[PDB]
Amino acid sequence: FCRNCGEAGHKEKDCMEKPRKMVLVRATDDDWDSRKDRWYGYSGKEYNELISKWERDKRNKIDEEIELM
Amino acid sequence: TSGAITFVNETPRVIEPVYTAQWSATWIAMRREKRDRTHFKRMRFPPF
Amino acid sequence: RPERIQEAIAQDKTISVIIDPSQIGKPLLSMKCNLYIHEILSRWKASLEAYHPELFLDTKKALFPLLLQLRRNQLAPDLLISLATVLYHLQQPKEINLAVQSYMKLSIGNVAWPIGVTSVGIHARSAHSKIQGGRNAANIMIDERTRLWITSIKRLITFEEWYTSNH
């Protein structure tokens, strides 16, 4: 098994930890829109930052003529 | 002097083991970040 | 403020509704047209029961910017000459058809292409770009409010044909 990780899965060249001196995966859907989707696993962080910025900006924010008559 | 063309006049010299170690460090960091993020927003093209 | 309104009503009983055809081709002509439109509205108001009553409020609202332009002498002269010709043939006793004909000169005009036509066929040529209607179009396509009052002049024409039919 890997020398520095201590897990049994991979090889010493494959260990994602930094070499020392001594996990959810996209489920395989194969629609071409689904592999090339820019917004995948989207929780809502960007929309919440947008709404919060707009709420702060909004919080900072807050007749007839003679002949017509 | 009239502003026509602008050549970058510099050749990039690197030490070879130092450059190998720099690419290995950023290889490991990009793997760790792809694992760590659930949602990776690849940017849209063309940018402008 | 009610003083100017009262003196203007006193001047409003003074000026008369007479369209002379030599006088068409400036401020007094606009006032005479303004007052003839008001008199048509008053002859509706005398007989509101027999018609459609549901069109009268909307007609007054759609006409009110036109009446404002005629009160302030701000109407464009090419358009006003056509409108005064409509209103002359409306004022005359029997030629109710020449009113609608000059109205068709008012609304569409003499433009070759009233509404633009774009991308007729598969084969594209440069001269097709002359066809389209942003440059020169009908008066009924200038603005959406102008559509309302030009339509309302036609509605007063139909009112007047009914009134000279019966009363």
Ligand SMILES: [Zn+2]
């Ligand atoms: Zn390992």
